[PDB]
RNA sequence: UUUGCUCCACACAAUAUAGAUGGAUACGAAUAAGGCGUCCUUGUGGCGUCGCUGAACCAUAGCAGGCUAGCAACGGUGCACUUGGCGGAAAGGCCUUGGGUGCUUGCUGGCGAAUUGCAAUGUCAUUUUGCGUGGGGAUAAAUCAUUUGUAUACGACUUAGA
RNA sequence: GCAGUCAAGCGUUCAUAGCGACAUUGCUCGGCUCUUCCUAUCAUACCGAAGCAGAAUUCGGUAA
RNA sequence: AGAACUGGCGAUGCGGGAUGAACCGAACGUAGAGUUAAGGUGCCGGAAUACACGCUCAUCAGACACCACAAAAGGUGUUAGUUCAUCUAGACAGCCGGACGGUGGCCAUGGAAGUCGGAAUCCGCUAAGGAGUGUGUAACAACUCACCGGCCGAAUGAACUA
RNA sequence: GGCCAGCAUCAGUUUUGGUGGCAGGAUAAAUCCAUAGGAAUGUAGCUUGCCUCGGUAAGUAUUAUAGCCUGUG
């Protein structure tokens, strides 16, 4: 519906998240996942780590500067989960991926902008209560990524500024919600009610 | 020195809990849980709403926050007796949830000219409300 | 989805033996044709007869007596397995016999990997008095004024993108 | 068999009060306050009459019910942790070399120095947890007392204090030397 | 051989840049963390050895030492780096308004043909009460988690026939970033 | 740790078809053994 | 370089667009829980209320939106001047102080539209430019050739020289 | 390994149509040099058992 | 391994089985439209992140296939069963107590009192207690349980099958 | 009279809705109504225990000031 669509890749599920982003593209929709670190997978930590690790064990024997480039950053860690999900060797693929954008944390001008979620890839909904999931921030760190802390720091501060903005918001909202209530029962008003609005 | 335990409070599935059917032939009508079968299935009947007495999944249905006094295993006439006596229909219509359902249905069956009335009335309401603000 | 059928047979009337004993049984099936076939399959096992030696005299749909009253059924089942065949007694709380045998067939496939051809339904009976209901998972629902919630509910999305961060309250 | 309702009863005495939102538990009483996160456990608490608490698991397998009882145990352990307190008495024995146990405070860490264990030049530093207080037993030779509120603080510190003194590459039967939890108990006896 | 020292290729320049720096304590006084000179020399020293526990305690040891020539390093700037999820990122460098002939030489490959018009508009950018320089220095002090010093060598005081000094970047391990940028 | 080698779940066509021949061999044995 | 090069204004040609055609409409966290409103012992506090979809909300009526007559109220909005404060994660944008300035469909009048002939996207977006204009602004280096030797198969590198 | 001793059950009912696991009892082409990989590790690291007084050691675990 | 009969390939394209000599589908002129087969419907990928009842958490799960090989088992993983058992004359668990005298039974021998070992392994008294279930002392003692009994108040126990 | 089109009424093949009449079965089974018996996870009442004033508990009580089941029509 929009030109761009900003997803809040938090508490999501890499897979179901990627797969809902993937096709979304191929259909020409621009997308920008954020808060990648906070992303989720499925299964007792170790589990995943052990998993990735075996992936981190595959290299072009004779010249490892040529083989599978193993990315840590939660982003890339989730760009490979969406990549291999799109005929990325063709042209219609490259053209697709090119309208995709993964961000670990939330930078501008995305900050000051609405950010959606994908119910069908929401861990809370999908997963069954009491079943180990494995955040993405951890896995990443414990395998190479080295900016977990910074972001964290830069994320907390990015919220504050956010909070305040809100506060200001909740207020101005109240004010309008109170004035409206006072505009009730006024011919015009009265009428609208009969026409739902 | 009090023992304040915030208690999460749910809609319990019980005999006499009124429900609203999401999908099917009935779809959007009220019924009362007459008897509980197992964890997934209940037994429902809303005679005044018109829904026949049936075994339904709780996936098909959504619990509403209203209750009334119904004895278990109640046949249709007993359900209609306690239904009318407790007046759960008017308690339903009083709630915000029924008003929201009726709101969507009112907007659905709107004529283009009636939609143009909404255009004009919202312009007028906007004017007086914007004057109501920029004062305090 | 099932249907109960009364199916009768009396090994074709020949010379010197007129009007044989009319063997009657209740058969759960999806339609009339499957019910007939299942009946012949059972007759060949109960005694030494064949499909060509007899005739279906009457096939009749047995509707449920009170499809509004929740019953406590007890079903005697036996079925062929990875090993030899063996008896089983499962207790099912349901509204109708058709629906109760339905839940049984899906449960037998789910817990024992037995398809439709293996399962021999022996006897479906109503358990009239409670505290004679043997199984504990059925007696679980026969307590006084049972009030249990459904915590953690999924909200089914019609679109791909939501603007709320969903609240799984109930 | 997937239970419909399972509940335990946490009995609250007079002196203590239990405040719970989501899954974070206050036990505010005479000796002090204790807090514990339990958002990993997935239960439901119910205060019936300000003196009895009801934990609850709805639709739980054997694994989920196994979690249900451990909440009752941990919250009760906080209650007895505030009313009675915990007192672990550790007696240290030696064959030849006198073990020299002292409390030092470098950078405000409140360490326990364990010197001269089995004639050893290494100086063992044990961290002291926030909420455990260490005093020596008067009129009883070779005894260290560990006391506080939390069971985890007192008992893990007692475990730390005896796992630093491992008899390494030697006998168990011949070398008695070490520190040992002689008595697990409460501060106030009744 | 040693697989760490790969690829075994020719370096980017003769002045190799320092890959890592000593950590940081935010209570220590402001002091430089790395220095540069010009290595040229090698010579023999004898000394009595006060190394107890050795076979040469209160004995004399002959040994080889090297003499790096180090003229007094001159400060001509400061760099401020913000901490990013992408590493570090230089947001603002500031210079010294009037720099030597040596560094304006470092900015060109052919020195003699040029009009020597290097920092003319930058020095004219200073030419007032500051106003923009203090603005960029506020920009560094406000943000920028680490602060590195731009220096250069005194090439003329060294017997080298090069005339062209080397720019470098040296971080500061003196706490409070305010004291870094104000040093 | 040094994560050891993982077994494949790709069944090669020689394996898959050889599985079918070995299966049908087990049938012909079972039909003969049923007679004794 | 016969004002070569950059930057503002309108002006004509060209060149394309993995694809504008009302608005990407900003708390955070929890889910066996939350949001909002109110109140007080100011707290993991009492009381009320809300969700069960954005099916929303904000914008939305004028020759693809012209020209005019007013009435009501100190509002809403466009444009350009303007006081600051804020924004470093890709900040390149966010709020705010005011003066002018058009427009307002809040309500009521009076003109104008047609013949695009019963439809034909019926072109109104945004890049990358070039030639012309009428105003501001700014006064280079690199390579070759020689030399150097901390470099060197040749390249390359480090040097040196109005 | 052969024969026997037990022997969960199954044998078309089922121990007297027969098969039968672990035990148990009977006597008795080779070699020079390098790179990479595997662990089924000889040493180095940390552990557990052992009449392990100490030293030394034996078996075992993690470990390339 | 030998016959017989039967298909397939061979002289045969096409749909599918990711891939392909023998596997599933399939009456090949050139086109248009509709419907299907086998196989499928997360995205790659055309088609339901359908619906409904269940089962599974795997330190490299599983998606696999006459259910064929390592395959008989081990497991205090989990869900269903079957057959025998106890149980408001009080089930399991839990502590509290009794747990006896003949009798330190005979040989054994330095010392062996139930508990280093060799053979029966008996009587009486009870509510019930073995010529004794392990720890223990040189030998005893002391403790333990198996057997009862006291409060405690509803279910529990064993052996198999899936 | 050539290139491309739009609509209408038609014909062939087909896809996708809306709505009416019937007929079959236990002439559906149900529900609903009338009648006759029962027990309950026991209903009003009644009796009793010990307390926060009236709540609960342990008997009766076949529905009385809830209802349910079965049978016949």
């Amino acid at each position: 519906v929009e030109p761009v669509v900003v997803i809040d890749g938090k508490g999501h599920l890499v897979g179901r998240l990627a797969s809902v982003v993937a096709k979304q593209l191929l259909n020409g929709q621009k997308i920008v996942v954020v808060r990648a670190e906070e992303l989720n997978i499925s299964g007792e930590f170790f589990r995943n780590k052990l998993k990735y690790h075996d992936f981190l064990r595959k290299a072009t024997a004779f010249n490892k500067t040529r083989g599978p480039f193993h990315f840590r950053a939660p982003s890339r860690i989730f760009y490979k989960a969406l990549r291999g999900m799109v005929s990325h060797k063709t042209a219609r693929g490259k053209a697709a991926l090119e309208r995709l954008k993964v961000f670990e944390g939330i930078p501008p001008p995305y900050d000051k902008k609405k950010r959606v979620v994908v119910p069908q890839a929401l861990r809370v909904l999908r997963l069954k209560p009491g079943r180990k999931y494995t955040t993405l921030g951890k896995l990443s760190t414990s395998v190479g990524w080295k900016y977990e802390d910074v972001v964290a720091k830069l994320e907390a501060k990015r919220k504050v500024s956010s909070a305040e903005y809100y506060a200001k918001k909740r207020a101005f909202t109240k004010k309008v919600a109170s004035a409206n209530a006072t505009a009730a029962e006024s011919d015009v008003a009265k009428q609208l009610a009969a026409l739902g609005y | 020195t009090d023992s304040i335990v915030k208690a999460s409070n749910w809609r319990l599935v019980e005999v006499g809990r009124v429900v609203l059917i999401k999908k099917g032939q009935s779809a959007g009508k009220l019924a009362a849980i007459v008897e509980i079968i197992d964890q997934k299935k209940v037994l429902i009947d809303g005679p005044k709403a018109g829904v026949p007495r049936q075994a339904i999944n709780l996936g098909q249905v959504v619990l509403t926050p209203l209750t009334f006094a119904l004895p278990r295993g109640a046949r249709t006439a007993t359900v209609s007796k306690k239904w009318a006596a407790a007046a759960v229909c008017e308690k339903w219509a009083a709630s915000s949830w029924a008003k929201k359902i009726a709101q969507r249905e009112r907007r659905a069956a709107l004529t283009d000219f009636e939609r143009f009335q909404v255009m004009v009335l919202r312009k007028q309401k906007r004017y007086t409300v914007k004057k109501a603000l920029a004062k305090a | 989805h099932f249907k109960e059928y009364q199916v009768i047979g009396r090994r074709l009337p020949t010379e010197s033996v007129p009007e044989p004993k009319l063997f009657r049984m209740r058969i759960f099936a999806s339609n009339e044709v499957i019910a007939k076939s299942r009946y012949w399959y059972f007759l060949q096992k109960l005694h030494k007869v064949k499909k060509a030696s007899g005739e279906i005299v009457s096939i009749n749909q047995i509707n449920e007596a009170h499809p509004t009253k929740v019953k406590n059924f007890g079903v005697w089942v036996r079925y062929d397995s990875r090993s030899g065949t063996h008896n089983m007694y499962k207790e099912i709380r349901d509204v109708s016999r058709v629906a109760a045998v339905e839940t049984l067939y899906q449960d037998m496939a789910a817990r024992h990997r037995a398809r439709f051809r293996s399962i021999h339904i022996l006897k479906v009976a109503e358990i009239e008095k409670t505290a004679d209901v043997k199984r504990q998972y059925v007696k679980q629902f026969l307590t006084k004024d049972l009030k249990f919630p459904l915590p953690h509910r999924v909200q089914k999305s019609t679109k791909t993108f939501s603007y709320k961060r969903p609240s799984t309250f109930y | 068999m997937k239970y419909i309702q399972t509940e335990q009863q946490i009995e609250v005495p007079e002196g203590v009060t239990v405040s719970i939102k989501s899954r974070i538990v206050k036990v505010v009483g005479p000796r002090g306050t204790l807090t514990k996160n339990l958002k990993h456990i997935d239960v439901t608490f119910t205060k019936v009459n300000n003196q009895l608490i009801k934990v609850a698991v709805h639709n739980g397998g054997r694994k989920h019910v196994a979690a249900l009882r451990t909440v009752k145990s941990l919250v009760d352990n906080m209650i007895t942790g505030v009313t009675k307190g915990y007192k672990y008495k550790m007696r240290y024995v030696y064959a030849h070399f006198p073990i020299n146990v002292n409390i030092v405070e470098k950078d405000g860490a409140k360490f326990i120095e364990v010197r001269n264990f089995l004639g050893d030049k290494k100086i063992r530093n044990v961290p002291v947890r926030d909420g455990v207080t260490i005093e020596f037993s008067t009129n009883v030779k070779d005894e260290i007392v560990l006391s506080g509120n939390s069971v985890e603080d007192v008992s893990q510190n007692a475990a730390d204090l005896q796992q630093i003194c491992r008899v390494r590459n030697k006998d168990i039967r011949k070398f008695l030397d070490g520190i040992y939890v002689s008595h697990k108990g409460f501060i106030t006896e009744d | 051989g040693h697989l760490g020292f790969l690829p075994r290729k020719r370096a980017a320049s003769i002045r190799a840049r320092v890959k890592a720096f000593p950590k940081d304590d935010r209570s220590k006084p402001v002091a430089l963390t790395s220095f540069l000179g010009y290595k040229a020399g090698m010579t023999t020293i004898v000394r009595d050895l006060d190394r107890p526990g050795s076979k040469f305690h209160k004995r004399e040891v002959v040994e080889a030492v090297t003499v790096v020539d180090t003229p007094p390093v001159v400060v001509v700037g400061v760099v401020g780096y913000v901490e990013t999820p992408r590493g570090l990122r230089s947001l603002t460098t500031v210079w010294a308004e009037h720099l030597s002939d040596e560094v304006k030489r470092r900015f060109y490959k052919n020195w003699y043909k040029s009009k020597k018009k290097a920092f003319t508009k930058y020095s004219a950018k200073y030419a007032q009460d500051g106003a923009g320089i203090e603005r960029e220095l506020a920009r560094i002090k406000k943000y920028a988690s680490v602060v590195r010093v731009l220096v250069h060598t005194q090439i003329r005081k060294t017997p080298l026939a090069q005339k062209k000094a080397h720019l470098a970047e040296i971080q500061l391990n003196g706490g409070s970033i305010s004291e870094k940028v104000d040093w | 740790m040094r994560v050891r080698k993982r077994q494949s779940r790709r069944t090669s066509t020689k394996l898959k078809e050889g599985i079918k021949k070995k299966a049908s061999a087990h049938r012909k044995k079972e039909k003969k053994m049923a007679k004794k």
Side-chain angles (χ1 to χ4, degrees):
Chain A
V1 60
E2 330 185 282
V4 172
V5 185
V6 195
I7 300 179
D8 189 4
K10 170 191 183 183
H12 276 104
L13 282 43
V14 174
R16 343 197 137 259
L17 170 51
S19 187
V20 306
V21 108
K23 141 102 26 202
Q24 253 318 127
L25 294 269
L26 307 158
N27 298 353
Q29 182 63 45
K30 290 185 169 56
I31 293 167
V32 171
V33 76
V34 319
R35 312 156 85 18
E37 76 258 23
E38 196 168 24
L39 201 85
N40 278 174
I41 302 170
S42 66
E44 133 63 347
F45 183 79
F46 187 63
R47 217 339 214 7
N48 302 200
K49 184 163 184 180
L50 161 81
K51 224 169 196 185
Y52 180 99
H53 242 118
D54 102 13
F55 158 67
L56 176 61
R57 75 142 333 170
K58 298 149 180 43
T60 306
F62 57 78
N63 178 131
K64 301 200 190 63
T65 198
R66 209 154 71 90
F69 294 150
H70 300 110
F71 287 66
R72 303 26 165 87
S75 34
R76 339 276 32 206
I77 188 72
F78 150 92
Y79 185 90
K80 201 211 79 166
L82 164 182
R83 182 181 161 211
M85 244 181 233
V86 182
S87 208
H88 96 265
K89 285 197 165 192
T90 61
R92 187 281 207 76
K94 296 183 190 188
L97 287 177
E98 219 166 88
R99 25 156 130 83
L100 157 52
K101 250 156 182 182
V102 175
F103 282 120
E104 290 156 359
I106 303 181
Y110 300 116
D111 331 290
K112 281 70 177 185
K113 317 219 62 177
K114 191 46 168 65
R115 59 167 64 68
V116 321
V117 301
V118 170
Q120 62 187 17
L122 231 333
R123 104 142 174 345
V124 74
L125 311 192
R126 294 306 306 189
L127 244 46
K128 191 171 77 57
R131 236 180 228 310
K132 306 188 157 306
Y133 49 174
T134 317
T135 262
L136 203 41
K138 279 53 180 178
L139 187 75
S140 296
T141 300
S142 73
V143 79
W145 198 44
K146 59 202 53 177
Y147 302 106
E148 177 159 336
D149 291 10
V150 104
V151 164
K153 178 173 187 179
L154 218 90
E155 239 313 302
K157 140 189 159 188
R158 166 322 274 305
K159 290 177 187 189
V160 179
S161 298
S162 70
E164 291 162 358
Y165 158 67
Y166 184 79
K168 278 172 154 293
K169 183 168 186 176
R170 91 166 79 173
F172 176 93
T173 64
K174 162 186 174 180
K175 206 163 60 175
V176 178
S178 52
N180 282 296
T182 302
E185 188 178 3
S186 171
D187 283 353
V188 55
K190 297 285 300 182
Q191 211 166 9
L192 272 177
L195 293 171
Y197 270 93
Chain B
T1 48
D2 293 319
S3 304
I4 306 300
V5 144
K6 308 271 180 159
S8 182
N9 178 48
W10 288 300
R11 298 183 191 101
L12 314 157
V13 0
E14 66 186 51
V15 170
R17 170 73 68 181
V18 61
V19 294
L20 186 74
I21 306 148
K22 291 186 278 178
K23 242 170 89 73
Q25 202 185 313
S26 308
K29 291 174 187 179
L30 304 140
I33 303 162
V34 170
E35 194 163 29
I36 31 98
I37 302 162
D38 63 330
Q39 179 74 234
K40 313 286 268 185
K41 286 173 278 169
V42 290
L43 181 78
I44 55 148
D45 184 72
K48 199 171 273 183
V51 48
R53 176 131 175 261
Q54 59 190 9
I56 210 147
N57 282 113
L58 293 137
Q60 307 221 16
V61 91
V62 60
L63 308 192
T64 64
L66 291 163
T67 52
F68 69 99
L70 188 110
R72 193 194 64 225
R75 338 167 59 65
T76 315
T78 312
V79 181
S80 189
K81 235 161 189 177
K82 308 282 180 187
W83 193 253
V88 288
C89 306
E90 303 227 2
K91 288 173 186 175
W92 169 253
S95 72
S96 184
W97 186 217
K99 285 183 175 180
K100 192 80 193 290
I101 295 160
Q103 200 180 334
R104 295 186 291 248
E105 202 188 316
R106 182 85 276 272
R107 284 167 195 215
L110 270 191
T111 311
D112 185 59
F113 169 62
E114 291 170 349
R115 209 173 292 116
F116 188 74
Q117 287 171 15
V118 179
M119 158 100 72
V120 176
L121 290 173
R122 295 180 80 270
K123 280 290 260 188
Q124 292 174 12
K125 198 194 182 180
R126 210 193 257 151
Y127 185 82
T128 61
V129 136
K130 291 287 173 71
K131 266 178 85 278
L133 274 107
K135 273 187 143 68
Chain C
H1 185 74
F2 287 103
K3 252 157 194 183
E4 196 170 12
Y5 290 103
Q6 170 201 57
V7 182
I8 66 167
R10 48 92 191 257
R11 46 160 105 87
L12 288 160
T14 55
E15 288 178 308
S16 77
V17 158
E19 295 174 55
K21 291 171 182 178
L22 307 126
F23 295 143
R24 186 259 179 182
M25 68 197 294
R26 303 161 81 76
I27 299 304
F28 292 109
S30 62
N31 49 38
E32 250 164 60
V33 193
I34 295 167
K36 258 163 202 176
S37 181
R38 287 300 288 170
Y39 174 74
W40 291 119
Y41 180 77
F42 285 131
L43 271 195
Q44 294 186 280
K45 277 173 167 66
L46 276 129
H47 43 90
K48 294 280 177 73
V49 290
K50 94 197 164 180
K51 190 179 166 69
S53 71
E55 194 180 46
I56 308 296
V57 183
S58 189
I59 186 152
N60 280 133
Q61 213 187 81
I62 309 158
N63 278 310
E64 213 277 325
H66 293 300
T68 35
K69 187 257 173 88
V70 180
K71 286 146 198 115
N72 281 114
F73 287 136
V75 186
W76 277 268
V77 203
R78 89 191 249 149
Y79 78 105
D80 301 299
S81 308
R82 189 179 178 177
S83 303
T85 185
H86 68 270
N87 287 111
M88 193 174 282
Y89 173 74
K90 280 184 179 172
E91 255 171 22
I92 304 149
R93 190 167 164 73
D94 216 333
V95 135
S96 85
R97 296 160 64 84
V98 33
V101 79
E102 162 70 29
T103 38
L104 187 131
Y105 266 109
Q106 308 275 93
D107 194 66
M108 283 306 299
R111 311 198 146 107
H112 298 300
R113 287 93 170 73
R115 33 184 162 185
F116 187 74
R117 310 268 147 210
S118 256
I119 294 152
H120 297 60
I121 300 294
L122 315 187
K123 195 265 237 287
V124 182
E126 225 183 83
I127 304 157
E128 230 155 62
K129 284 181 179 179
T130 55
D132 302 327
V133 174
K134 303 177 207 173
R135 279 330 170 258
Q136 187 85 55
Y137 62 88
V138 192
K139 209 175 180 180
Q140 195 166 64
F141 295 97
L142 313 173
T143 55
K144 197 211 284 179
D145 231 7
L146 183 54
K147 300 183 172 188
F148 70 101
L150 301 141
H152 194 100
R153 79 136 135 87
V154 286
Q155 183 68 44
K156 208 183 290 300
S157 190
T158 52
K159 289 196 282 172
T160 49
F161 305 109
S162 178
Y163 299 90
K164 267 194 164 188
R165 182 65 56 87
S167 184
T168 169
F169 91 101
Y170 207 59
Chain D
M1 59 173 163
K2 200 88 167 287
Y3 282 95
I4 196 153
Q5 266 204 39
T6 44
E7 64 160 34
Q8 306 294 317
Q9 293 172 29
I10 309 164
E11 292 187 303
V12 183
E14 289 190 335
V16 294
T17 52
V18 282
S19 281
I20 305 159
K21 210 192 172 189
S22 69
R23 271 101 82 200
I24 330 288
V25 185
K26 266 103 220 68
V27 182
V28 184
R31 205 162 280 270
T33 58
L34 284 175
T35 53
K36 180 174 273 162
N37 183 18
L38 298 165
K39 281 166 92 173
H40 57 79
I41 214 90
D42 195 9
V43 296
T44 312
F45 305 110
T46 317
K47 181 261 288 183
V48 66
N49 56 6
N50 294 106
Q51 284 181 325
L52 203 143
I53 307 303
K54 293 176 185 189
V55 298
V57 155
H58 312 134
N59 282 295
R62 197 144 68 182
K63 216 65 69 72
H64 203 206
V65 172
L68 188 269
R69 180 64 173 82
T70 200
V71 192
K72 190 252 202 170
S73 293
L74 291 172
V75 177
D76 187 76
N77 280 329
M78 280 189 284
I79 283 160
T80 56
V82 175
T83 62
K84 293 181 178 180
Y86 291 103
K87 185 192 272 177
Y88 277 35
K89 291 172 171 178
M90 290 192 81
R91 191 169 77 165
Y92 57 96
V93 287
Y94 61 92
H96 186 275
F97 300 99
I99 304 161
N100 310 316
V101 180
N102 294 310
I103 300 103
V104 298
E105 292 88 7
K106 53 185 194 182
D107 304 331
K110 293 191 175 184
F111 287 154
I112 296 165
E113 277 188 356
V114 182
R115 290 168 181 265
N116 206 7
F117 171 77
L118 221 137
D120 209 66
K121 302 285 174 183
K122 194 200 190 177
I123 303 150
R124 279 84 180 265
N125 293 110
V126 176
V128 164
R129 304 202 173 272
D130 296 321
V132 58
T133 53
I134 288 89
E135 59 175 59
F136 290 107
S137 177
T138 327
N139 72 52
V140 186
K141 286 184 182 287
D142 298 320
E143 200 190 327
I144 181 167
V145 178
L146 303 136
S147 61
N149 285 334
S150 183
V151 212
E152 290 87 18
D153 293 338
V154 183
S155 200
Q156 188 58 58
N157 216 149
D160 289 326
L161 224 147
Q162 78 158 54
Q163 284 187 330
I164 51 101
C165 276
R166 283 198 208 275
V167 179
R168 197 197 179 93
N169 295 319
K170 297 292 190 70
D171 262 331
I172 295 99
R173 304 181 295 232
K174 189 78 173 74
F175 303 133
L176 305 144
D177 307 352
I179 314 159
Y180 295 102
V181 187
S182 66
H183 188 269
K184 301 170 182 172
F186 307 126
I187 295 162
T188 55
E189 196 181 53
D190 193 66
Chain E
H2 194 287
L3 299 170
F5 295 92
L6 262 66
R8 216 152 70 250
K9 73 186 285 298
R10 304 218 290 269
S13 289
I14 279 99
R15 190 192 64 82
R17 80 276 172 277
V18 175
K19 288 209 165 181
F21 277 132
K23 284 182 92 281
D24 201 352
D25 181 75
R26 210 156 275 267
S27 68
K28 284 182 182 182
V30 187
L32 256 68
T33 61
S34 57
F35 197 80
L36 50 67
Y38 292 103
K39 198 266 258 186
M42 194 75 60
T43 177
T44 343
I45 309 304
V46 308
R47 70 179 187 101
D48 57 327
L49 197 75
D50 299 321
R51 193 181 282 157
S54 307
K55 258 185 87 78
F56 312 107
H57 189 61
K58 299 296 182 290
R59 259 65 59 93
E60 296 165 358
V61 64
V62 75
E63 58 199 347
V65 302
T66 167
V67 177
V68 44
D69 193 20
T70 48
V73 147
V74 31
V75 172
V76 289
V78 121
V79 194
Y81 293 95
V82 297
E83 255 182 32
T84 58
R86 289 140 71 84
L88 293 165
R89 176 258 166 108
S90 59
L91 87 161
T92 302
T93 64
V94 68
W95 294 93
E97 184 212 2
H98 293 287
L99 290 87
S100 182
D101 200 71
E102 305 172 352
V103 270
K104 286 170 98 283
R105 186 179 265 135
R106 170 64 55 182
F107 277 83
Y108 314 121
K109 220 154 285 293
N110 293 316
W111 170 245
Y112 85 112
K113 277 178 283 188
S114 61
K115 294 281 186 74
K116 305 172 186 76
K117 200 167 269 191
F119 280 76
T120 52
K121 292 191 205 181
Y122 183 86
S123 300
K125 195 258 293 297
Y126 190 95
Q128 54 179 344
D129 59 336
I133 305 294
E134 206 66 49
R135 179 68 269 163
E136 298 301 313
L137 255 95
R139 176 74 46 79
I140 294 158
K141 201 196 265 79
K142 194 172 176 175
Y143 317 115
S145 65
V146 70
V147 180
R148 299 196 190 174
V149 176
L150 286 163
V151 308
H152 76 92
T153 346
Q154 283 175 8
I155 186 67
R156 53 93 188 180
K157 210 185 262 78
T158 298
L160 282 165
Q162 207 191 342
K163 290 194 184 82
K164 196 177 178 284
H166 304 82
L167 258 311
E169 271 200 19
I170 293 92
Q171 86 160 22
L172 300 155
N173 278 150
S176 69
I177 38 86
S178 176
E179 284 185 305
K180 291 192 208 287
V181 66
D182 294 337
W183 185 94
Chain F
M1 302 83 207
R2 194 274 328 274
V3 187
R4 301 189 176 194
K5 201 195 173 183
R6 168 78 194 276
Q7 292 289 328
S8 69
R9 303 291 181 275
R10 275 180 116 139
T11 44
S12 62
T13 59
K14 190 178 264 289
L15 257 165
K16 195 201 85 180
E17 286 282 308
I19 272 154
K20 301 281 102 181
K21 284 181 189 71
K22 200 209 271 287
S24 189
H26 186 83
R27 187 178 276 269
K28 293 175 188 75
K29 171 173 255 177
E30 276 191 359
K31 284 180 88 73
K32 280 175 78 72
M33 266 68 169
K35 284 183 177 180
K36 272 82 80 178

